Coordinates of C-alpha atoms in Angstrom, one line a residue:
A1 CA -20.2 54.6 5.9
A2 CA -18.4 51.3 5.5
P3 CA -17.4 50.7 1.7
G4 CA -19.5 48.8 -0.7
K5 CA -19.5 45.1 -1.1
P6 CA -16.5 43.9 -3.4
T7 CA -16.8 41.0 -5.9
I8 CA -14.0 38.5 -6.0
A9 CA -12.9 37.9 -9.6
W10 CA -12.9 34.6 -11.3
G11 CA -9.5 33.0 -11.0
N12 CA -7.7 29.9 -9.9
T13 CA -8.8 28.5 -6.5
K14 CA -6.4 25.4 -6.3
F15 CA -3.0 25.6 -4.7
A16 CA -0.4 23.3 -3.2
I17 CA 2.0 23.5 -0.3
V18 CA 3.8 20.5 -1.8
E19 CA 3.9 20.6 -5.6
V20 CA 4.0 17.5 -7.9
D21 CA 4.9 17.7 -11.5
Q22 CA 2.8 15.3 -13.5
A23 CA 5.1 14.6 -16.4
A24 CA 8.1 14.0 -14.3
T25 CA 9.8 10.6 -14.5
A26 CA 12.6 11.2 -12.0
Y27 CA 11.8 11.6 -8.3
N28 CA 14.0 14.6 -7.9
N29 CA 11.9 16.4 -10.5
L30 CA 8.5 15.1 -9.2
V31 CA 8.0 16.8 -5.9
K32 CA 8.9 20.3 -4.5
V33 CA 8.1 21.0 -0.7
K34 CA 7.4 24.5 0.2
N35 CA 6.7 26.1 3.6
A36 CA 3.4 27.4 2.4
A37 CA 1.3 27.8 -0.8
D38 CA 1.4 31.1 -2.7
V39 CA -2.3 32.2 -2.8
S40 CA -3.6 35.0 -5.0
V41 CA -7.1 36.7 -5.2
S42 CA -8.3 39.7 -7.2
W43 CA -11.4 41.6 -6.8
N44 CA -13.5 44.6 -7.9
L45 CA -15.9 47.2 -6.6
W46 CA -17.2 49.0 -9.6
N47 CA -19.3 51.6 -8.0
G48 CA -18.8 53.3 -4.6
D49 CA -16.1 54.1 -2.2
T50 CA -13.4 51.6 -2.2
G51 CA -12.3 52.3 1.3
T52 CA -8.7 52.6 2.4
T53 CA -7.9 49.0 3.4
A54 CA -8.5 45.5 1.8
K55 CA -8.3 42.4 3.8
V56 CA -8.4 38.7 2.7
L57 CA -10.1 36.4 5.2
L58 CA -10.1 32.5 5.2
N59 CA -13.0 31.3 7.3
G60 CA -13.3 34.7 8.8
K61 CA -9.7 34.9 10.0
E62 CA -7.5 37.5 8.4
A63 CA -4.9 36.3 6.0
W64 CA -3.7 39.6 4.3
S65 CA -4.1 43.3 4.6
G66 CA -3.2 46.3 2.3
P67 CA -4.2 49.6 0.9
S68 CA -7.4 49.8 -1.1
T69 CA -6.1 51.8 -4.1
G70 CA -9.1 51.8 -6.4
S71 CA -11.9 49.9 -7.8
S72 CA -9.6 46.7 -8.5
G73 CA -7.2 44.9 -6.4
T74 CA -5.0 41.8 -6.0
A75 CA -3.5 40.2 -3.0
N76 CA -0.8 37.6 -2.8
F77 CA -0.3 35.6 0.5
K78 CA 0.9 32.5 2.0
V79 CA -1.2 29.6 3.5
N80 CA 0.8 27.2 5.5
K81 CA -1.8 24.6 6.4
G82 CA -3.8 22.5 3.9
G83 CA -7.6 22.5 3.7
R84 CA -10.6 23.9 1.9
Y85 CA -11.3 27.5 3.0
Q86 CA -14.0 30.1 2.3
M87 CA -12.1 33.1 1.1
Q88 CA -13.5 36.6 1.3
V89 CA -12.2 40.1 0.5
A90 CA -13.2 42.9 2.7
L91 CA -12.9 46.6 1.9
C92 CA -12.6 48.8 5.1
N93 CA -12.5 52.4 6.3
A94 CA -12.9 54.1 9.5
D95 CA -16.8 53.2 9.5
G96 CA -16.2 49.4 9.2
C97 CA -15.4 46.4 6.7
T98 CA -17.7 45.1 4.1
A99 CA -17.0 41.5 3.1
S100 CA -17.5 39.7 -0.2
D101 CA -19.5 36.5 -0.7
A102 CA -17.2 33.5 -0.1
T103 CA -15.0 31.9 -2.9
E104 CA -13.7 28.6 -1.9
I105 CA -10.0 27.7 -2.3
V106 CA -8.2 24.4 -2.0
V107 CA -4.8 24.4 -0.5
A108 CA -3.3 20.9 -0.9
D109 CA -0.8 19.2 1.5
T110 CA 0.5 15.7 1.8
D111 CA -1.5 14.9 4.9
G112 CA -4.7 14.9 2.8
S113 CA -6.2 17.9 4.7
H114 CA -7.7 19.2 1.5
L115 CA -9.5 16.0 0.6
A116 CA -12.9 14.6 1.5
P117 CA -12.8 11.2 3.3
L118 CA -12.4 8.3 0.9
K119 CA -15.0 6.3 2.8
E120 CA -15.9 3.5 0.4
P121 CA -18.5 0.8 0.6
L122 CA -17.1 -2.7 1.4
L123 CA -16.8 -4.9 -1.8
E124 CA -17.1 -8.6 -2.6
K125 CA -17.5 -10.7 0.7
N126 CA -16.0 -8.1 3.0
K127 CA -18.0 -7.6 6.1
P128 CA -17.9 -4.6 8.7
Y129 CA -16.2 -5.3 12.0
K130 CA -15.5 -3.2 15.2
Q131 CA -11.8 -2.9 16.0
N132 CA -12.1 -3.9 19.7
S133 CA -9.6 -6.8 19.5
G134 CA -6.7 -4.6 20.6
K135 CA -4.5 -6.6 18.2
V136 CA -2.9 -5.7 14.9
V137 CA -4.9 -6.5 11.6
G138 CA -2.6 -5.5 8.7
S139 CA -2.3 -6.2 5.1
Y140 CA -0.1 -5.2 2.1
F141 CA -1.2 -3.1 -0.9
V142 CA 1.1 -3.4 -3.9
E143 CA 1.8 -0.2 -5.9
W144 CA 1.6 -2.1 -9.2
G145 CA -1.7 -3.7 -8.3
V146 CA -3.6 -0.7 -10.0
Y147 CA -2.7 -2.2 -13.4
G148 CA -3.4 -5.9 -14.3
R149 CA -4.8 -6.8 -10.8
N150 CA -7.2 -3.7 -11.3
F151 CA -7.1 -3.1 -7.5
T152 CA -6.8 0.6 -6.4
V153 CA -6.9 2.1 -3.0
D154 CA -10.6 2.7 -3.1
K155 CA -11.2 -1.1 -3.1
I156 CA -9.1 -1.6 0.2
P157 CA -11.6 -2.6 2.9
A158 CA -9.8 -0.1 5.2
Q159 CA -12.2 -0.2 8.0
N160 CA -11.1 -3.8 8.8
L161 CA -7.5 -2.9 9.0
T162 CA -5.3 -1.5 11.7
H163 CA -2.2 -1.3 9.6
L164 CA -1.9 -0.8 5.7
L165 CA 1.6 -1.6 4.3
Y166 CA 2.7 0.0 1.0
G167 CA 4.9 -2.3 -1.1
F168 CA 7.3 -1.2 -2.0
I169 CA 9.4 2.0 -1.6
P170 CA 12.8 1.2 -3.4
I171 CA 16.3 2.3 -2.7
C172 CA 18.2 3.9 -5.5
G173 CA 21.1 2.1 -7.2
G174 CA 22.0 0.6 -10.6
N175 CA 24.3 -2.3 -11.4
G176 CA 25.6 -4.3 -8.4
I177 CA 23.1 -2.5 -6.2
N178 CA 19.6 -3.6 -7.5
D179 CA 20.7 -6.5 -9.6
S180 CA 17.7 -8.5 -8.5
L181 CA 15.4 -6.0 -10.2
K182 CA 16.7 -7.2 -13.5
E183 CA 14.8 -10.5 -13.2
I184 CA 11.6 -8.6 -13.8
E185 CA 11.1 -7.0 -17.2
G186 CA 11.5 -3.3 -17.3
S187 CA 11.7 -3.1 -13.4
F188 CA 15.3 -2.4 -13.1
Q189 CA 15.1 0.3 -15.9
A190 CA 12.1 1.9 -14.2
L191 CA 14.0 2.3 -11.1
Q192 CA 17.0 4.0 -13.0
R193 CA 14.6 6.3 -14.6
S194 CA 13.2 7.2 -11.2
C195 CA 16.6 7.7 -9.6
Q196 CA 18.0 9.9 -12.4
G197 CA 20.3 12.3 -10.8
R198 CA 19.5 10.8 -7.4
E199 CA 22.3 9.5 -4.9
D200 CA 22.5 5.8 -4.6
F201 CA 21.1 4.4 -1.3
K202 CA 18.5 7.1 -1.0
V203 CA 14.8 5.9 -1.1
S204 CA 12.7 6.9 -4.1
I205 CA 9.4 6.0 -5.7
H206 CA 9.6 2.9 -8.0
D207 CA 6.6 3.9 -10.2
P208 CA 5.9 7.6 -9.9
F209 CA 2.9 7.4 -12.3
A210 CA 1.1 4.8 -10.3
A211 CA 2.1 6.5 -6.9
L212 CA 1.2 10.0 -7.8
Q213 CA 0.0 10.8 -11.4
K214 CA -2.6 8.1 -12.6
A215 CA -6.1 9.4 -12.1
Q216 CA -8.0 7.5 -9.5
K217 CA -11.2 7.9 -7.6
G218 CA -11.6 11.2 -5.8
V219 CA -8.2 12.3 -7.2
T220 CA -8.9 12.7 -10.9
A221 CA -8.0 16.2 -12.1
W222 CA -4.9 17.6 -13.9
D223 CA -4.4 20.0 -11.1
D224 CA -5.1 17.7 -8.3
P225 CA -1.5 17.6 -7.0
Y226 CA -1.5 14.1 -5.5
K227 CA -3.2 11.4 -7.6
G228 CA -2.5 7.6 -7.9
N229 CA -2.0 5.7 -4.8
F230 CA -0.5 8.5 -2.7
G231 CA -3.4 10.8 -3.3
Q232 CA -6.0 8.1 -2.4
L233 CA -4.1 7.0 0.6
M234 CA -4.2 10.6 1.7
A235 CA -8.0 10.7 1.3
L236 CA -8.2 7.3 3.0
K237 CA -6.2 8.8 6.0
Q238 CA -9.0 11.3 6.2
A239 CA -11.7 8.6 6.4
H240 CA -9.8 6.5 8.9
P241 CA -7.3 8.7 10.9
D242 CA -6.4 5.7 13.2
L243 CA -5.3 3.5 10.3
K244 CA -1.5 3.3 10.3
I245 CA -0.3 3.4 6.7
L246 CA 3.4 2.5 6.5
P247 CA 5.8 2.5 3.4
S248 CA 7.6 -0.9 3.1
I249 CA 11.2 -0.6 1.9
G250 CA 12.4 -3.8 0.5
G251 CA 10.8 -7.1 -0.5
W252 CA 12.2 -9.8 -2.7
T253 CA 13.7 -7.7 -5.6
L254 CA 14.3 -4.5 -3.8
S255 CA 16.4 -5.8 -0.9
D256 CA 19.8 -6.0 -2.5
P257 CA 20.9 -2.4 -1.3
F258 CA 20.4 -3.4 2.4
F259 CA 23.5 -5.6 2.1
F260 CA 25.7 -2.7 1.5
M261 CA 24.5 -0.8 4.7
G262 CA 27.2 -2.2 6.8
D263 CA 28.9 0.9 5.5
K264 CA 27.6 3.6 7.8
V265 CA 28.0 6.2 5.2
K266 CA 25.6 4.4 3.0
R267 CA 23.2 3.6 6.0
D268 CA 23.3 7.2 7.2
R269 CA 22.4 8.3 3.7
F270 CA 19.5 5.9 3.6
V271 CA 18.2 6.7 7.1
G272 CA 18.3 10.4 6.2
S273 CA 16.5 9.9 2.9
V274 CA 13.9 8.0 5.0
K275 CA 13.4 11.1 7.2
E276 CA 13.0 13.3 4.2
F277 CA 10.5 10.9 2.6
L278 CA 8.2 11.0 5.7
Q279 CA 8.6 14.7 5.8
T280 CA 7.6 15.0 2.1
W281 CA 4.7 12.4 2.5
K282 CA 3.0 13.3 5.8
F283 CA 0.2 10.7 5.4
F284 CA 2.7 7.9 6.2
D285 CA 2.9 6.9 9.8
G286 CA 6.4 5.4 10.1
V287 CA 8.5 2.9 8.1
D288 CA 8.5 -0.9 7.5
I289 CA 11.7 -2.6 6.7
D290 CA 11.4 -5.7 4.6
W291 CA 15.0 -6.8 4.0
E292 CA 14.9 -10.2 2.5
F293 CA 17.0 -11.4 4.0
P294 CA 19.9 -10.5 6.4
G295 CA 22.6 -13.1 5.9
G296 CA 21.5 -13.9 2.3
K297 CA 19.3 -16.6 0.6
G298 CA 17.0 -14.0 -0.7
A299 CA 16.7 -13.2 -4.5
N300 CA 20.4 -12.5 -5.0
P301 CA 22.6 -15.6 -4.7
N302 CA 25.7 -13.3 -4.4
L303 CA 24.6 -11.4 -1.4
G304 CA 24.6 -12.1 2.3
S305 CA 27.1 -11.7 5.2
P306 CA 27.1 -12.7 8.8
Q307 CA 27.8 -9.1 9.5
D308 CA 24.2 -8.6 8.4
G309 CA 22.7 -9.4 11.8
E310 CA 24.6 -6.6 13.4
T311 CA 23.8 -4.3 10.4
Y312 CA 20.2 -5.1 10.9
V313 CA 20.3 -4.2 14.6
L314 CA 22.1 -1.0 13.8
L315 CA 19.6 0.0 11.0
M316 CA 16.6 -0.4 13.3
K317 CA 18.2 1.6 16.2
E318 CA 19.2 4.4 13.8
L319 CA 15.7 4.5 12.3
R320 CA 14.2 4.5 15.8
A321 CA 16.4 7.5 16.7
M322 CA 15.4 9.2 13.4
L323 CA 11.7 8.7 14.1
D324 CA 12.2 9.9 17.6
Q325 CA 13.9 13.1 16.3
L326 CA 11.2 13.5 13.7
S327 CA 8.4 13.1 16.4
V328 CA 10.1 16.0 18.3
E329 CA 9.8 18.2 15.2
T330 CA 6.2 17.2 14.3
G331 CA 4.5 16.0 17.5
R332 CA 3.3 12.7 15.8
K333 CA 3.9 9.2 16.9
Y334 CA 5.7 6.9 14.3
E335 CA 5.9 3.1 14.0
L336 CA 8.9 1.3 13.1
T337 CA 8.2 -2.3 11.8
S338 CA 10.1 -5.1 10.1
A339 CA 9.1 -8.3 8.2
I340 CA 11.4 -11.3 9.1
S341 CA 11.7 -14.7 7.7
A342 CA 9.6 -17.3 9.4
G343 CA 11.9 -20.1 8.6
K344 CA 15.0 -20.7 6.5
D345 CA 18.4 -22.0 7.6
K346 CA 20.2 -20.1 10.5
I347 CA 16.9 -18.2 11.3
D348 CA 17.7 -19.1 15.0
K349 CA 21.0 -17.2 14.6
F350 CA 19.2 -14.2 13.0
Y351 CA 16.5 -14.4 15.8
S352 CA 19.1 -13.5 18.3
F353 CA 19.6 -10.2 16.6
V354 CA 15.8 -9.7 16.5
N355 CA 15.9 -10.1 20.2
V356 CA 18.4 -7.2 20.5
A357 CA 16.5 -4.9 18.0
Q358 CA 13.0 -5.7 19.2
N359 CA 12.8 -2.6 21.5
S360 CA 13.5 -0.4 18.4
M361 CA 10.3 -1.9 16.9
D362 CA 6.6 -1.6 17.3
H363 CA 5.7 -4.8 15.6
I364 CA 7.5 -7.7 13.9
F365 CA 5.6 -9.1 10.8
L366 CA 6.5 -12.8 10.8
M367 CA 6.3 -14.0 7.2
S368 CA 4.8 -17.4 8.0
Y369 CA 4.1 -18.5 4.4
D370 CA 6.1 -19.5 1.4
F371 CA 7.2 -22.6 3.3
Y372 CA 6.6 -24.6 0.1
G373 CA 5.9 -23.7 -3.5
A374 CA 6.8 -24.4 -7.2
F375 CA 10.4 -23.3 -6.4
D376 CA 10.8 -27.0 -5.0
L377 CA 9.1 -29.7 -7.4
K378 CA 10.4 -32.5 -5.1
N379 CA 9.4 -31.6 -1.6
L380 CA 5.8 -30.7 -1.4
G381 CA 4.0 -29.3 1.6
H382 CA 1.8 -26.7 3.2
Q383 CA 3.1 -23.3 2.4
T384 CA 1.5 -21.4 5.3
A385 CA 0.3 -24.0 7.8
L386 CA 0.2 -23.5 11.6
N387 CA 1.6 -27.0 12.5
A388 CA 3.3 -30.0 10.8
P389 CA 1.0 -32.5 9.0
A390 CA 0.3 -36.0 10.3
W391 CA 2.6 -37.6 7.6
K392 CA 5.6 -35.5 8.6
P393 CA 5.6 -34.3 12.2
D394 CA 9.2 -33.1 12.0
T395 CA 8.4 -30.5 9.3
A396 CA 10.9 -27.6 10.1
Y397 CA 8.9 -24.8 8.4
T398 CA 5.7 -24.1 10.2
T399 CA 4.1 -21.0 11.7
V400 CA 4.5 -22.4 15.4
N401 CA 8.2 -23.3 14.8
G402 CA 8.8 -19.8 13.7
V403 CA 7.0 -18.2 16.7
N404 CA 8.6 -20.7 19.1
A405 CA 12.0 -20.0 17.8
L406 CA 11.6 -16.2 18.2
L407 CA 10.2 -16.7 21.7
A408 CA 13.0 -19.0 22.5
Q409 CA 15.4 -16.3 21.6
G410 CA 13.6 -13.8 23.9
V411 CA 11.5 -11.8 21.4
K412 CA 8.6 -10.5 23.4
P413 CA 5.4 -12.2 21.9
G414 CA 3.3 -9.0 21.8
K415 CA 5.7 -7.9 19.0
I416 CA 5.0 -10.9 17.0
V417 CA 2.4 -10.6 14.2
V418 CA 1.6 -13.8 12.4
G419 CA 1.4 -14.0 8.7
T420 CA -1.7 -15.2 6.7
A421 CA -1.6 -15.6 2.9
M422 CA -4.2 -14.3 0.5
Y423 CA -2.7 -16.4 -2.3
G424 CA -1.9 -20.0 -2.8
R425 CA 1.2 -21.6 -4.1
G426 CA 0.9 -24.6 -6.3
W427 CA 2.2 -27.3 -8.5
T428 CA 1.2 -29.2 -11.6
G429 CA 1.4 -32.9 -12.4
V430 CA 1.8 -34.1 -8.7
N431 CA 2.3 -37.8 -9.0
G432 CA 3.8 -40.8 -7.0
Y433 CA 1.9 -39.9 -3.9
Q434 CA 0.7 -42.5 -1.2
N435 CA -2.5 -42.6 0.8
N436 CA -4.1 -40.0 -1.4
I437 CA -1.9 -37.4 0.2
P438 CA -0.7 -35.4 -2.8
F439 CA 2.1 -33.7 -0.8
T440 CA 3.9 -37.1 -0.5
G441 CA 4.6 -37.2 -4.3
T442 CA 6.5 -34.9 -6.6
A443 CA 5.6 -32.4 -9.2
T444 CA 6.5 -31.7 -12.9
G445 CA 6.1 -27.9 -12.6
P446 CA 4.3 -25.0 -11.3
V447 CA 0.4 -24.7 -11.2
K448 CA -0.8 -22.2 -13.8
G449 CA -1.0 -18.9 -11.8
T450 CA -3.3 -16.0 -11.7
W451 CA -0.6 -13.4 -12.7
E452 CA 2.7 -15.4 -12.5
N453 CA 3.4 -19.1 -12.4
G454 CA 3.0 -21.1 -9.3
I455 CA 0.8 -18.5 -7.4
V456 CA -2.9 -18.1 -7.3
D457 CA -5.0 -15.3 -5.8
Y458 CA -7.2 -16.6 -3.0
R459 CA -10.1 -15.0 -4.9
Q460 CA -9.4 -17.4 -7.8
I461 CA -9.1 -20.4 -5.6
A462 CA -12.5 -19.7 -4.0
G463 CA -14.1 -18.8 -7.3
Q464 CA -12.9 -21.5 -9.5
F465 CA -10.9 -24.4 -7.7
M466 CA -13.0 -25.5 -4.7
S467 CA -15.3 -27.9 -6.6
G468 CA -16.1 -29.7 -9.8
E469 CA -12.8 -31.0 -11.1
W470 CA -11.2 -29.9 -7.8
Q471 CA -11.2 -31.5 -4.3
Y472 CA -11.2 -29.1 -1.4
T473 CA -9.6 -30.7 1.6
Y474 CA -8.8 -29.2 5.0
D475 CA -5.8 -30.8 7.0
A476 CA -7.0 -30.4 10.6
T477 CA -3.6 -31.4 12.0
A478 CA -1.5 -28.8 10.1
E479 CA -4.4 -26.3 10.0
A480 CA -4.0 -25.9 6.3
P481 CA -6.3 -26.3 3.3
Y482 CA -5.5 -27.3 -0.1
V483 CA -7.4 -28.0 -3.4
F484 CA -6.3 -30.8 -5.9
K485 CA -7.3 -31.7 -9.3
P486 CA -6.4 -35.3 -9.8
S487 CA -7.0 -35.3 -13.6
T488 CA -3.9 -33.0 -13.9
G489 CA -2.0 -33.3 -10.6
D490 CA -2.7 -29.6 -9.9
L491 CA -2.1 -29.0 -6.2
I492 CA -2.5 -25.7 -4.4
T493 CA -1.8 -24.9 -0.8
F494 CA -3.2 -21.7 0.7
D495 CA -5.0 -20.1 3.7
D496 CA -8.8 -20.1 4.2
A497 CA -11.1 -18.7 6.7
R498 CA -10.7 -21.9 8.9
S499 CA -6.9 -22.0 8.9
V500 CA -6.9 -18.1 9.3
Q501 CA -9.1 -18.7 12.4
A502 CA -6.7 -21.3 13.8
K503 CA -3.9 -18.8 13.5
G504 CA -6.0 -16.0 15.1
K505 CA -7.0 -18.2 18.0
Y506 CA -3.3 -19.3 18.4
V507 CA -2.5 -15.7 18.5
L508 CA -4.9 -15.1 21.3
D509 CA -3.7 -18.0 23.4
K510 CA 0.0 -17.2 23.0
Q511 CA -0.7 -13.5 23.5
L512 CA 1.0 -12.6 20.2
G513 CA 0.4 -9.2 18.5
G514 CA -2.1 -9.9 15.7
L515 CA -2.3 -10.9 12.1
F516 CA -1.1 -9.6 8.9
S517 CA -1.5 -10.6 5.4
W518 CA -0.1 -10.7 1.7
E519 CA -1.6 -9.2 -0.5
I520 CA -4.8 -7.2 0.1
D521 CA -5.9 -7.2 -3.6
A522 CA -6.0 -11.1 -3.9
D523 CA -8.6 -11.6 -1.1
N524 CA -12.4 -11.8 -1.8
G525 CA -13.1 -10.8 1.8
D526 CA -13.2 -14.3 3.5
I527 CA -9.5 -13.9 4.7
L528 CA -9.6 -10.5 6.1
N529 CA -13.1 -11.4 7.6
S530 CA -11.7 -14.4 9.3
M531 CA -8.7 -12.3 10.4
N532 CA -11.0 -9.9 12.2
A533 CA -13.5 -12.4 13.7
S534 CA -10.8 -14.9 14.9
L535 CA -8.8 -12.1 16.7
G536 CA -12.1 -10.9 18.6
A537 CA -13.8 -8.4 16.5
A538 CA -17.5 -9.0 15.9
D539 CA -20.0 -7.9 13.3
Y540 CA -21.3 -4.4 12.8
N541 CA -34.1 3.2 -18.4
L542 CA -31.1 4.5 -20.1
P543 CA -31.2 5.9 -23.6
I544 CA -30.5 3.7 -26.6
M545 CA -26.9 4.4 -27.6
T546 CA -24.3 3.1 -30.1
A547 CA -20.5 2.8 -29.5
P548 CA -17.7 0.5 -30.5
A549 CA -17.1 -2.7 -28.7
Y550 CA -14.9 -2.5 -25.7
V551 CA -11.3 -3.7 -26.7
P552 CA -9.4 -5.3 -23.9
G553 CA -5.9 -4.1 -23.9
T554 CA -6.9 -0.6 -25.0
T555 CA -6.1 2.3 -22.6
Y556 CA -9.0 4.8 -22.8
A557 CA -8.9 8.5 -22.2
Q558 CA -11.5 10.3 -20.2
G559 CA -14.9 10.4 -22.0
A560 CA -14.5 7.2 -24.1
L561 CA -17.7 5.4 -24.9
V562 CA -17.5 1.6 -25.3
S563 CA -20.3 -1.0 -25.8
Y564 CA -19.8 -3.9 -23.5
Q565 CA -22.4 -6.5 -22.3
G566 CA -25.4 -4.8 -23.8
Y567 CA -24.6 -1.3 -22.3
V568 CA -22.8 1.8 -23.5
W569 CA -20.3 2.9 -21.0
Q570 CA -18.2 6.0 -20.3
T571 CA -14.9 6.6 -18.6
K572 CA -15.2 9.2 -15.8
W573 CA -11.5 9.8 -15.8
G574 CA -8.3 8.9 -17.8
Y575 CA -5.8 6.1 -18.2
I576 CA -8.4 3.3 -18.0
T577 CA -7.6 -0.2 -19.0
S578 CA -10.3 -2.1 -17.1
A579 CA -13.3 -3.8 -18.3
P580 CA -16.6 -1.7 -17.9
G581 CA -18.2 -2.6 -14.5
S582 CA -15.1 -3.9 -12.8
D583 CA -14.4 -0.4 -11.0
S584 CA -15.9 2.9 -10.4
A585 CA -14.0 4.4 -13.3
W586 CA -16.9 3.5 -15.8
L587 CA -20.4 5.0 -15.9
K588 CA -23.2 3.2 -17.5
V589 CA -24.9 5.7 -19.9
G590 CA -26.8 3.8 -22.6
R591 CA -28.4 0.7 -23.8
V592 CA -27.5 -1.2 -27.0
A593 CA -30.3 -2.0 -29.5
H594 CA -31.6 -5.7 -29.0

């Protein structure tokens, strides 16, 4: 008859097509891409005929066959597609095959095919919306927000986004190549660590720990290959497969290397390293280029050339060609996007190049914000307004001026995605102002910020600065709110649900492409809610315990027990710096004796 039923032996059941080293600090030592995972299974049949053939099956489909040589066996075989499989062993002879009970294996891959959907409840004021607008609704998630800002991927209101942008993927290079990074403590050094033994002008990951290694919800375990932001983004992709997740190369302090890419040798190296990046990290859907800025006047006062416009056009063409080739190899569609200045000097000269490059690009992210801020204590104004204010109708830097200038140069309007701000910029000691318009005065310094000087999370504006000592006024001509504390001259300019709605309605009239925002962590929900609504979407007992007092600033290992606000808490995973209750990493386990 058919052989007896074999029993799979206890063994490892977690495997990876792309491996990640968890202690690695350099990108070259961090990830190894394989064609398949090497899977192994052992089994026994302690009594009976062991048959002449052994088979391994994954979800019933045969993965391996070999001779059955006794009451014990091992098989090694390759799995080239990620997922969770039900593995069985079958012993066979001429009378048939007898299969084992299923043992489940996990084969990891950077598309997330091994992960359950990260489908998280909406937090704070976020409301559910149905993506029928047809427009872009995008936001930026910062790699480093998982620390002080305490904002991880599981907190993203992903269902209300069409695009999620990941800031920022860096370009390798030391002195002369990333000098701007030196203005941030430890940031330049962190990039050198990451690029050890890696060619300059290749992309890397700025913070491998935050991106891949730090335990986060749903990706907590030492032998979970992808943790941190990449792992969660992969799970998120499982939950929202139409969400476009783009890596964003550049930004304010990581833009310097673009200025060297007039050299095609360097540019080809960069473009290739990007193709490799998207091949290593399959959950990404394309690339966003945030060169601040072609021609100069970014962070670095020594960088900028008129050659840069041409260089920008070439970079976008070559990237498009790369993604086209990559689409051939993988069958997938890829998006190429860029964020461009909404208004500086000679932006009209740059916009002509945008007109040439627009057919390489799916969307243009118009950075219609940072028009004013603590970087100018003498000329105050609305940092992200739609129009000019009554008191200065000739204000150069407004959303509408940026959009008109682009259109004037022949940029198709459907490409144009208008920027909204989830932060305010602000000043202190505003004085010498007429008509109770604080913007007509001058300032003595930056407003005290949430994390850095002169910049305030919208959540803190709404939470703390809209009342009491503060006056909340909406400029219906500019379409721009501000709050003002006359006792101290504190003045903050920002976006709110009303001004966001003005932008969204404007987008609908002018047939522009949608809205995007910076940065998702700083919203309380009102901004993203208004972004969706205005673009057309519509609505949808514990045991007494004892434990040391939680100490802010302490980094806790898994299983720590702290007392905090009358309860005893427990970290569900490691590397926790947040206060208990502020995220899903703490578990309420006890009461403190009152």
